[PDB]
Amino acid sequence: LEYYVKLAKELEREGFHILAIKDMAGLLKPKAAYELIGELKSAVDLPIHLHTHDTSGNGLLTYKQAIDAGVDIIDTAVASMSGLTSQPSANSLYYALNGFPRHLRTDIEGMESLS
Amino acid sequence: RITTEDPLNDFMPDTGTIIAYRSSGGFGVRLDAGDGFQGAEISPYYDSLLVKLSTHAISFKQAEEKMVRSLREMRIRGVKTNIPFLINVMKNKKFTSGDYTTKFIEETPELFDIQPSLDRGTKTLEYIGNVTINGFPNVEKRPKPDYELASIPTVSSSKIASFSGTKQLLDEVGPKGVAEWVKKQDDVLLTDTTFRDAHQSLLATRVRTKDMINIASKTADVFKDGFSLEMWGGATFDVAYNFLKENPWERLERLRKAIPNVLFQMLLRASNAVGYKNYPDNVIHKFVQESAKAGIDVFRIFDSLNWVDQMKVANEAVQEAGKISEGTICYTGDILNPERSNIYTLEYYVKLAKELEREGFHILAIKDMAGLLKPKAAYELIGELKSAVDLPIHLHTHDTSGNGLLTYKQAIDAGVDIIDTAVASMSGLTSQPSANSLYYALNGFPRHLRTDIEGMESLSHYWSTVRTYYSDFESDIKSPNTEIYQHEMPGGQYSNLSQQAKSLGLGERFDEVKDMYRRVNFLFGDIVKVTPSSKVVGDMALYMVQNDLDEQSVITDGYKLDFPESVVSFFKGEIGQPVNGFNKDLQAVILKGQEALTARPGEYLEPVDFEKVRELLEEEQQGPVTEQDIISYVLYPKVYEQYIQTRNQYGNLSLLDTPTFFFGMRNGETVEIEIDKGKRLIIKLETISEPDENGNRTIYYAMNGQARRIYIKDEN
Amino acid sequence: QIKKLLVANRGEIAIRIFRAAAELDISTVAIYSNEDKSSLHRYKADESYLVGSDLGPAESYLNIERIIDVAKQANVDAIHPGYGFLSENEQFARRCAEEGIKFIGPHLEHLDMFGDKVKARTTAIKADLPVIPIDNPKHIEVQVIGDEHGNIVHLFERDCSVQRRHQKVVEVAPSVGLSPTLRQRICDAAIQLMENIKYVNAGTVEFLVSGDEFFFIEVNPRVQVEHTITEMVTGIDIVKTQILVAAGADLFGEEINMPQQKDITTLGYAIQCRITTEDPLNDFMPDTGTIIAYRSSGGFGVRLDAGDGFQGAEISPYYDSLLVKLSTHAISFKQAEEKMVRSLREMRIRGVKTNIPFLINVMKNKKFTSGDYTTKFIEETPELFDIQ
Ligand SMILES: CC(C)(COP(=O)(O)OP(=O)(O)OC[C@H]1O[C@@H](n2cnc3c(N)ncnc32)[C@H](O)[C@@H]1OP(=O)(O)O)[C@@H](O)C(=O)NCCC(=O)NCCS
Ligand SMILES: O=CCCCC[C@@H]1SC[C@@H]2NC(=O)N[C@@H]21
Ligand SMILES: [Mn+2]
Ligand SMILES: [Mn+2]
């Protein structure tokens, strides 16, 4: 967690507008996504943008946690084009957040239709 | 004199082409070879007599011993033989005595008691050849693939006999005491649904016993600390007898011995257990009794409509059996959305739970059959129930939405006791959430999964290679579908509906079919939608879109319409009484005068005379017939009779490996079919001939170094 | 007591024993390698199992511990070794008993005794038997059996004097041209060396005889290929007796109704010939290849012990050439001879070379009919090899 902080401050210093997390293998587990993103927010002033692959199947579980920690943007895919080695399914994430403090800014039905 | 005269037909000298012919040699034996050999054609115009086999020895009894042995050793397939009759004479007390007369045969009835040597060699060939040329049903007449021969990690059975988990627990402290043990556990105990619900969702329930039992050793060690295995109930009973032509009771029994450490569990439908129509109470009693007598430990008892009065019979049966009774509450609606329903409320479920506890269920189960239990609703729901009731809570769901994991995680936060899962390669989508996924998903969280990932990974790998054998039964659904939150079709249903929609010429209008699905629900007063009640709502939408019918013109136009049987049946109360009631207008128009049932259909039916079924099945067969045979014909009359004819035709098919079962063989392939531990038939299909004057094709096999000859009628 | 008998062998002898166990009503187990996947002996038993696949043709019947594994997984209480694989292996027999399994054979102290020639000669000297210092000798051997209670009986001599170097080509019992006394000395000595060392189960004492003098050769602490003959001229089941003697049954008891020594005779004469893929034109090197047509004899006085010879699967080079073990019986010797010859012509194997044409010309040759034949019979007979 200390490496990621140091790295973020440095990229912030380098003058990037947005800090991104590339999880190209989908290793960022649920709790890891709450703790990592949670720190990064207080450590840096950059909006955090998180991107994973649903290879473990816990991609959605990961996004909810990231959202619980104040992440600003995620990377998603349309349902019929999601999961496994792709992004976590937006279509699911939309209903997954139902009942929680943060909602997904997007168009439900259009996304069923896109799918 | 070994002859073709039939001892079971007043010695009518049988005739035809001798397929196998194998001899006896050895000390004291002699053979004068007549007309029997390799491939002889036996004429009806000759003194039918294949060989004379005679024995010598210093002493009479020793002569008989050599003759008996020589008789059993002698092998003649294709035509009939008097061999069984000769064996019986050698046995007989009056023959050995030496003091027999010419009266002997006519004075000695026990001689004519023969028993058919079920010929497992010929029958394996006669089956394999038939699928090879005329193919399996619901497959493709392609060649034969399956090219990853994944080995089967197994575990010494002695090691197993020393595991000690729930099956052991249930013997020490009973149901109540097992349920008290569940309560103590911090970890989340899991139920694996691989053997039952997983493939019932993904592979049209098609998974055979041979695959499951090939991996029984590994499963016992992998789920050593599991709560239960779900490996029966649902569609399995029917489908095994029918599509698979294997006895479910066998799969039960066999899996039983391989896994003597873990609780076994089925899905038992309140109304009819596992059957297809309605049945008198004592068929429910019988069935449960047998199930628990033969291995099943837990009975998840659900009603298609959450109608409590309908699950008391199953309850009393399970309770008698000394086994574990699990009261189920099918979830629909959405307790998060208060505009969704003011019946299927948080209070609805609390009271219902509280009620079932009063009926004395050991475990409260939740069966979200359509995967509608959104994560937050599952936190609030489960949370609510733990402090409302004392039963341990068993949650089950379908990853149909892609949120199955999330739901489970939340459920665990809320203190849940048991979850249903399936190995990674047999999960997700319409299946349950993946155990593998869940295990790491909870890393760095308060409660963990009591299981073994490394053993689980192996399973996932296996089942992945096994899934390949079932490629033809791979269901449509390739990705999660969140529309289930509007229309609410359980797992499958939105598949069959679409195949049906396209079948009734409504392929492009399926969006309206969907729409009418949600509508019919509310038209029927918003009903719980599991089977068989989801087909009801299925059929109406399908029928209402077909006949261009409205919400209001279903009443208006009713008296001319004549609705789908399934619908009319529902309104007779043949599936129980829905939580809200029947709309008096809508019932009248559909029934058109017909008598609607007041109470559950069970107390409308007369009890079955089991000894009359015994009477009938004893006569119909040669004379076996068990208690499991009886409830089995009662439950499925047609399907059971059809199984027996197949068991008569091809022997015990379940013994075949899956790929050979669906495909037969290719030219020049060698397969090994294990017919019994010790007896493996090494078969090679050398060639197959073009059909003859009859459409009969000739298959030249080699079996255990001997060539064989089979005639297969080509359907075309 | 014996419940499940496993045969640590293959081909003819597995079948021979299986037949003898199924007479006693004993469940049977066979074992095999990938090359016997097609063998006859496999399905002659109730069960049969591939002894580990990672094992080639050879050790798949030599592999001591892995064979015992099978034995153990099958709940086998007794094993019959037969011959020519683990039969004379005393480490097998030892490890065997340590795992609860009755080795159907002599006690472990006999196998060790009769292995090496220097021990073989040592125990023979103590007996009173004569031993070698040498042309024209006769290869006579005596069959004995003895239960686990002392009791031994000889089932008389077998004349094997028809042999090229190794290979006991053609075998006769009883001997012809051997005066009952001359030959009493041989059988008596046979039993005298066996009585000394308290022999158990069935074995053979081998001898060379010169007119009147004779010398001990070796002891075969097991059954013999040529046992067939002695069985027929005495009516005694040798392989049956084997199993039963191991289960601990007394000879003169009700389960093997053994006549005492004087009551045991030989009626008639028997002769056996092994039919092998040996090319009698090419220094007796066996053919391999596939069998395309197999057809056999029968009738009065013919006895067949099937092996690896039948209408189908090819013969491997890895095991002993032996196909069929053919034997004949009658009072007069001339009747037995005529039955072998005729039998042999009627014998028909196409697809691979056989020793039959040769095997015919041994029977026809009247210097074999005389009885005064010798170990150098094939040595001294050229017309024995015939083009035909
Ligand atoms: C039980 C048995 C004795 C007769 O029963 P059956 O119903 O007539 O034949 P089964 O269906 O039981 O056996 C099916 C096939 O198993 C095969 N088989 C039997 N034992 C086998 C073994 N150990 N390994 C492999 N295959 C075997 C046989 O080929 C038989 O078919 P076949 O009669 O056309 O040759 C039979 O299984 C058998 O052949 N057993 C071994 C031989 C035997 O017992 N001989 C008598 C004394 S030697
Ligand atoms: O086309 C049919 C040829 C015979 C194959 C029979 C198999 S048995 C299992 C499955 N169930 C059936 O009713 N038939 C197939
Ligand atoms: Mn990427
Ligand atoms: Mn389910």
Side-chain angles (χ1 to χ4, degrees):
Chain A
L1 178 56
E2 282 69 51
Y3 166 88
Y4 294 113
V5 169
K6 189 159 175 153
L7 205 67
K9 248 96 88 89
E10 157 141 56
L11 297 165
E12 181 168 275
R13 279 197 302 277
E14 270 291 300
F16 287 89
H17 312 280
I18 295 174
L19 182 82
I21 302 272
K22 206 164 164 46
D23 191 10
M24 58 283 175
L27 305 171
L28 194 68
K29 300 165 164 172
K31 184 53 95 143
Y34 185 90
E35 285 176 8
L36 186 55
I37 301 289
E39 270 285 297
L40 297 176
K41 292 301 281 161
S42 73
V44 307
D45 275 324
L46 257 33
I48 297 154
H49 184 166
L50 163 75
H51 158 107
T52 189
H53 297 290
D54 187 47
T55 317
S56 61
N58 296 133
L60 295 164
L61 226 166
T62 283
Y63 280 170
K64 207 282 255 80
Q65 288 282 333
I67 298 154
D68 276 25
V71 85
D72 303 82
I73 321 153
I74 36 89
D75 277 16
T76 29
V78 195
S80 59
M81 286 277 272
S82 95
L84 301 188
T85 61
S86 205
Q87 273 54 266
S89 139
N91 298 243
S92 308
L93 185 56
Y94 185 93
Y95 296 100
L97 288 190
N98 283 206
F100 290 110
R102 302 176 70 214
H103 188 149
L104 190 68
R105 193 184 276 171
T106 189
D107 171 6
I108 3 88
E109 291 166 45
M111 274 217 283
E112 307 291 52
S113 188
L114 275 210
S115 172
Chain B
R1 272 176 306 307
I2 296 175
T3 48
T4 57
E5 39 193 45
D6 193 343
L8 249 266
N9 202 6
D10 268 294
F11 284 69
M12 261 155 177
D14 196 30
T15 198
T17 34
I18 288 191
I19 325 185
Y21 184 102
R22 171 194 310 129
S23 229
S24 174
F27 178 56
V29 178
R30 175 197 171 155
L31 301 151
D32 314 358
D35 297 304
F37 59 89
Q38 307 173 52
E41 313 162 343
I42 291 62
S43 160
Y45 298 107
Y46 294 122
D47 216 303
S48 82
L49 189 161
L50 320 143
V51 267
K52 33 209 268 189
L53 148 79
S54 55
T55 69
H56 188 28
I58 34 88
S59 141
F60 186 33
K61 90 192 196 95
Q62 199 132 18
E64 194 256 301
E65 292 183 6
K66 264 178 174 48
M67 188 69 76
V68 151
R69 196 268 288 107
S70 278
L71 284 167
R72 305 196 152 145
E73 179 170 9
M74 280 296 296
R75 205 59 41 91
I76 303 153
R77 301 255 177 246
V79 298
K80 292 215 179 81
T81 52
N82 83 320
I83 288 189
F85 190 82
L86 301 166
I87 282 163
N88 271 70
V89 174
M90 307 298 96
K91 299 287 220 97
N92 212 81
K93 199 136 264 197
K94 312 305 168 198
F95 187 67
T96 286
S97 140
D99 277 336
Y100 55 86
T101 47
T102 70
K103 321 281 270 63
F104 170 67
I105 273 173
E106 49 175 291
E107 281 184 28
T108 306
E110 66 269 8
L111 252 46
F112 287 89
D113 288 24
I114 75 150
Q115 33 174 159
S117 78
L118 276 179
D119 195 359
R120 295 144 204 71
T122 306
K123 287 180 168 137
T124 316
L125 306 166
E126 205 95 36
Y127 180 87
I128 280 164
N130 206 238
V131 166
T132 289
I133 306 154
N134 323 299
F136 205 76
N138 255 350
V139 177
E140 281 193 33
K141 262 262 299 292
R142 94 199 93 152
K144 161 182 166 182
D146 314 309
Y147 278 74
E148 254 94 275
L149 327 153
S151 205
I152 313 167
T154 48
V155 166
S156 60
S157 82
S158 60
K159 247 247 291 182
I160 264 152
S162 60
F163 297 134
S164 187
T166 60
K167 227 293 177 195
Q168 285 53 248
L169 191 58
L170 172 59
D171 301 327
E172 329 257 330
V173 295
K176 289 166 153 46
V178 155
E180 276 285 64
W181 170 86
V182 172
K183 293 188 210 189
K184 296 135 91 73
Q185 308 323 296
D186 182 64
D187 293 344
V188 192
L189 305 179
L190 67 105
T191 274
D192 195 79
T193 64
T194 296
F195 295 151
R196 200 282 296 198
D197 199 12
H199 71 283
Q200 192 198 120
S201 298
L202 299 141
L203 311 154
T205 328
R206 253 31 173 246
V207 177
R208 281 169 78 254
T209 297
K210 172 131 189 149
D211 296 319
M212 292 171 205
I213 210 262
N214 272 156
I215 199 83
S217 71
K218 195 41 159 50
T219 300
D221 153 60
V222 180
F223 302 106
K224 64 157 53 190
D225 304 340
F227 167 77
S228 76
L229 297 170
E230 221 251 299
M231 47 78 256
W232 231 42
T236 46
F237 194 98
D238 176 51
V239 178
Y241 267 123
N242 187 213
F243 292 127
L244 301 183
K245 301 282 183 183
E246 61 196 47
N247 180 179
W249 290 109
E250 289 180 39
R251 188 196 293 189
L252 180 41
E253 266 144 23
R254 300 248 272 127
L255 279 161
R256 229 324 132 196
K257 280 179 61 276
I259 317 200
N261 49 316
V262 189
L263 285 193
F264 283 39
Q265 169 174 333
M266 55 162 109
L267 184 66
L268 198 86
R269 202 196 283 97
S271 70
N272 59 182
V274 105
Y276 74 106
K277 55 197 184 93
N278 269 317
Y279 307 82
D281 290 350
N282 79 140
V283 171
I284 287 187
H285 270 95
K286 205 83 168 86
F287 178 75
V288 164
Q289 222 49 40
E290 281 310 302
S291 301
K293 212 187 259 173
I296 293 275
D297 289 318
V298 167
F299 290 68
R300 181 178 285 165
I301 293 157
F302 84 106
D303 190 69
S304 63
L305 297 183
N306 288 343
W307 189 41
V308 170
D309 259 75
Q310 182 138 241
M311 43 209 293
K312 293 188 201 171
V313 179
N315 205 45
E316 288 166 55
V318 173
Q319 287 278 149
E320 202 187 317
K323 299 281 171 155
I324 287 161
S325 200
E326 189 167 303
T328 323
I329 304 189
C330 296
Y331 187 85
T332 48
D334 171 13
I335 72 173
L336 298 175
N337 180 305
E339 290 205 305
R340 172 51 257 261
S341 178
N342 68 150
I343 335 102
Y344 295 117
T345 263
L346 179 61
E347 199 176 357
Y348 171 75
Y349 295 111
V350 174
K351 211 167 99 149
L352 203 46
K354 229 166 199 309
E355 190 177 346
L356 295 160
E357 174 177 61
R358 210 146 40 218
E359 276 292 303
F361 289 99
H362 303 284
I363 298 195
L364 180 80
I366 290 151
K367 189 167 159 63
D368 171 20
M369 63 277 170
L372 291 159
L373 190 60
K374 285 187 254 191
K376 189 54 171 188
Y379 182 74
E380 291 184 20
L381 166 73
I382 297 303
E384 270 293 324
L385 308 185
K386 288 249 86 177
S387 83
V389 312
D390 280 336
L391 283 31
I393 301 139
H394 201 142
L395 171 66
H396 147 96
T397 195
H398 300 244
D399 190 51
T400 201
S401 66
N403 293 144
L405 294 154
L406 239 169
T407 291
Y408 272 15
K409 185 276 195 254
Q410 283 294 319
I412 300 157
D413 285 356
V416 85
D417 298 292
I418 315 165
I419 50 132
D420 283 13
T421 48
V423 320
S425 86
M426 286 279 260
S427 81
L429 302 191
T430 44
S431 218
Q432 341 300 322
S434 145
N436 300 243
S437 295
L438 190 49
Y439 177 100
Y440 300 97
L442 290 189
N443 277 186
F445 280 120
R447 314 177 58 206
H448 314 260
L449 215 67
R450 190 92 96 30
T451 192
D452 164 7
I453 18 92
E454 214 145 327
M456 195 139 46
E457 296 286 33
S458 258
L459 285 194
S460 177
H461 287 297
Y462 170 77
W463 278 107
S464 173
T465 302
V466 165
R467 192 169 169 161
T468 289
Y469 306 153
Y470 297 95
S471 94
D472 283 296
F473 308 104
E474 282 293 352
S475 83
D476 291 358
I477 299 89
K478 298 304 220 334
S479 60
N481 198 191
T482 40
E483 285 166 6
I484 63 155
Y485 293 135
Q486 14 289 1
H487 70 232
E488 306 196 325
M489 238 154 311
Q493 254 273 312
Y494 91 59
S495 228
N496 320 243
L497 214 84
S498 196
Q499 273 164 42
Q500 210 171 176
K502 265 145 221 82
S503 172
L504 281 135
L506 289 162
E508 271 86 59
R509 261 162 85 198
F510 188 84
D511 331 300
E512 290 175 329
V513 183
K514 267 191 274 183
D515 190 0
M516 212 67 85
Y517 195 97
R518 172 153 183 115
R519 294 214 280 183
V520 164
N521 172 261
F522 287 124
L523 194 83
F524 285 11
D526 178 31
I527 62 158
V528 163
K529 282 170 272 42
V530 249
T531 221
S533 92
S534 36
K535 186 172 89 82
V536 174
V537 174
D539 283 313
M540 258 290 222
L542 227 21
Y543 173 83
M544 219 157 307
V545 156
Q546 173 176 192
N547 290 96
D548 261 25
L549 301 155
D550 269 44
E551 233 86 343
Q552 265 41 52
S553 79
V554 165
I555 304 171
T556 289
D557 291 348
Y559 297 95
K560 54 189 191 176
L561 287 168
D562 169 44
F563 293 96
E565 270 261 3
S566 65
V567 180
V568 13
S569 172
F570 173 62
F571 280 102
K572 281 183 192 183
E574 280 184 354
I575 295 160
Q577 296 286 323
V579 176
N580 339 60
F582 293 118
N583 174 80
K584 272 178 147 53
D585 298 6
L586 202 67
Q587 205 194 24
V589 284
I590 285 160
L591 298 170
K592 300 175 220 307
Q594 278 305 311
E595 293 247 359
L597 311 193
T598 329
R600 34 169 289 266
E603 56 193 59
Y604 279 107
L605 285 150
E606 290 301 302
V608 169
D609 191 328
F610 295 124
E611 35 271 22
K612 272 256 266 295
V613 209
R614 171 83 70 185
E615 218 168 294
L616 176 77
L617 275 151
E618 288 308 352
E619 224 289 322
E620 289 210 308
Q621 284 169 40
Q622 52 183 192
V625 169
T626 53
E627 293 293 1
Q628 322 194 130
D629 277 320
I630 298 153
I631 6 95
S632 235
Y633 168 93
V634 189
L635 292 167
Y636 295 90
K638 262 211 293 274
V639 168
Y640 173 84
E641 304 275 53
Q642 227 143 211
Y643 170 80
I644 303 290
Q645 315 289 313
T646 299
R647 192 226 274 163
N648 290 154
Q649 219 205 333
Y650 297 126
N652 200 124
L653 283 178
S654 67
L655 297 186
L656 278 51
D657 70 283
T658 293
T660 321
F661 181 68
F662 294 126
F663 292 101
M665 297 195 221
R666 305 168 257 96
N667 283 204
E669 177 194 357
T670 293
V671 321
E672 287 181 6
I673 300 308
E674 181 195 9
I675 308 305
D676 227 13
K677 192 214 142 207
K679 297 184 209 275
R680 280 170 86 85
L681 303 179
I682 293 102
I683 309 174
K684 184 190 222 252
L685 201 174
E686 258 139 39
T687 184
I688 285 170
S689 73
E690 303 293 68
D692 54 17
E693 46 169 26
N694 310 141
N696 279 314
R697 278 184 161 190
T698 319
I699 307 173
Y700 300 47
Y701 300 90
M703 200 190 41
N704 294 213
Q706 257 186 314
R708 203 56 63 95
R709 247 207 199 89
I710 284 315
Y711 297 112
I712 299 294
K713 187 79 160 63
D714 176 15
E715 266 70 286
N716 229 145
Chain C
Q1 336 105 114
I2 298 180
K3 281 311 186 180
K4 223 155 168 182
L5 187 149
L6 170 150
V7 173
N9 222 122
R10 60 174 307 284
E12 66 91 10
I13 188 62
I15 304 173
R16 172 69 185 93
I17 297 148
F18 286 137
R19 298 190 166 132
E23 275 183 52
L24 286 180
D25 214 316
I26 298 170
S27 275
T28 49
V29 180
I31 40 169
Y32 60 96
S33 45
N34 324 341
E35 17 282 308
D36 290 330
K37 235 195 283 163
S38 49
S39 174
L40 192 54
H41 89 260
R42 282 189 59 260
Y43 50 100
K44 284 319 221 173
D46 307 307
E47 287 142 283
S48 65
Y49 313 95
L50 173 131
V51 197
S53 56
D54 80 289
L55 327 160
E59 74 258 48
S60 284
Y61 301 93
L62 292 166
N63 199 306
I64 351 87
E65 315 270 12
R66 209 100 175 254
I67 294 175
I68 281 156
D69 292 346
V70 176
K72 289 172 85 184
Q73 327 289 355
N75 305 289
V76 169
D77 57 359
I79 302 162
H80 206 323
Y83 69 68
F85 283 120
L86 287 175
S87 35
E88 325 200 317
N89 197 329
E90 152 222 8
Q91 183 61 75
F92 171 81
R94 186 178 305 113
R95 262 295 294 163
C96 236
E98 297 176 2
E99 301 282 63
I101 301 166
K102 228 296 160 207
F103 174 84
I104 299 154
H107 285 326
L108 32 156
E109 54 242 323
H110 307 265
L111 287 80
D112 156 287
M113 198 192 295
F114 300 126
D116 205 311
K117 319 294 271 187
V118 192
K119 288 186 187 184
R121 268 175 31 88
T122 285
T123 22
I125 284 165
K126 191 112 80 166
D128 210 275
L129 266 64
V131 221
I132 37 180
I134 326 296
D135 64 324
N136 272 131
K138 292 276 293 209
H139 206 83
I140 270 288
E141 63 182 22
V142 182
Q143 186 59 98
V144 320
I145 324 180
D147 50 45
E148 262 142 82
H149 319 289
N151 316 125
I152 300 159
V153 288
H154 73 72
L155 296 192
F156 295 97
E157 24 59 287
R158 285 180 286 255
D159 185 318
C160 315
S161 299
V162 178
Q163 36 161 51
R164 79 181 221 106
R165 336 210 191 203
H166 322 109
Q167 173 83 54
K168 275 170 180 156
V169 189
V170 174
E171 318 94 81
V172 183
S175 185
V176 198
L178 229 87
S179 58
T181 46
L182 193 170
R183 150 257 290 239
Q184 198 59 228
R185 322 227 349 246
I186 310 159
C187 281
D188 285 8
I191 256 171
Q192 204 181 324
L193 140 146
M194 287 315 199
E195 211 87 300
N196 251 131
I197 53 93
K198 233 101 165 63
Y199 193 90
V200 155
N201 228 301
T204 319
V205 202
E206 288 188 11
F207 293 101
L208 266 39
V209 187
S210 279
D212 196 24
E213 319 98 52
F214 68 104
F215 304 107
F216 152 84
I217 310 308
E218 63 186 0
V219 183
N220 301 309
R222 53 155 170 103
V223 234
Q224 271 187 131
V225 224
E226 63 269 22
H227 71 280
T228 306
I229 314 155
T230 281
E231 313 213 82
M232 289 190 288
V233 215
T234 58
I236 286 101
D237 187 333
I238 273 150
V239 174
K240 193 94 131 271
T241 299
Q242 270 183 313
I243 301 158
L244 269 162
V245 159
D250 178 295
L251 290 174
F252 335 126
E254 257 222 31
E255 318 93 340
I256 29 184
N257 209 67
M258 251 301 167
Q260 220 89 10
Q261 204 54 247
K262 66 270 216 286
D263 293 356
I264 309 160
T265 19
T266 66
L267 174 137
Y269 297 88
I271 32 195
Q272 135 171 140
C273 79
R274 280 157 275 200
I275 300 180
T276 66
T277 49
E278 276 157 75
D279 188 6
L281 291 137
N282 198 28
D283 299 28
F284 301 91
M285 326 301 202
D287 202 312
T288 37
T290 310
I291 287 160
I292 53 184
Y294 176 94
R295 196 177 66 209
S296 79
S297 204
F300 178 56
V302 172
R303 189 197 133 152
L304 294 178
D305 287 46
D308 278 311
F310 55 88
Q311 180 94 208
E314 53 251 302
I315 311 309
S316 51
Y318 303 101
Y319 313 101
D320 279 336
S321 48
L322 171 59
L323 294 154
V324 204
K325 185 189 270 178
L326 160 73
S327 322
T328 49
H329 199 36
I331 336 101
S332 81
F333 191 75
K334 201 204 175 186
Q335 286 278 21
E337 184 261 64
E338 286 178 358
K339 230 130 220 146
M340 187 81 101
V341 173
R342 203 283 334 287
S343 288
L344 293 158
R345 322 294 199 116
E346 198 168 7
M347 278 306 296
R348 212 64 109 269
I349 291 187
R350 307 278 181 190
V352 323
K353 283 110 186 95
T354 44
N355 50 351
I356 298 178
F358 173 75
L359 287 180
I360 291 159
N361 290 38
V362 184
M363 304 295 149
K364 267 185 90 265
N365 204 242
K366 207 260 160 160
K367 85 170 78 172
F368 166 74
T369 318
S370 68
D372 284 334
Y373 51 91
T374 169
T375 201
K376 289 197 262 74
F377 156 73
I378 319 174
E379 197 111 334
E380 306 175 308
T381 312
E383 78 268 1
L384 219 51
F385 305 103
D386 261 322
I387 41 167
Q388 52 171 309

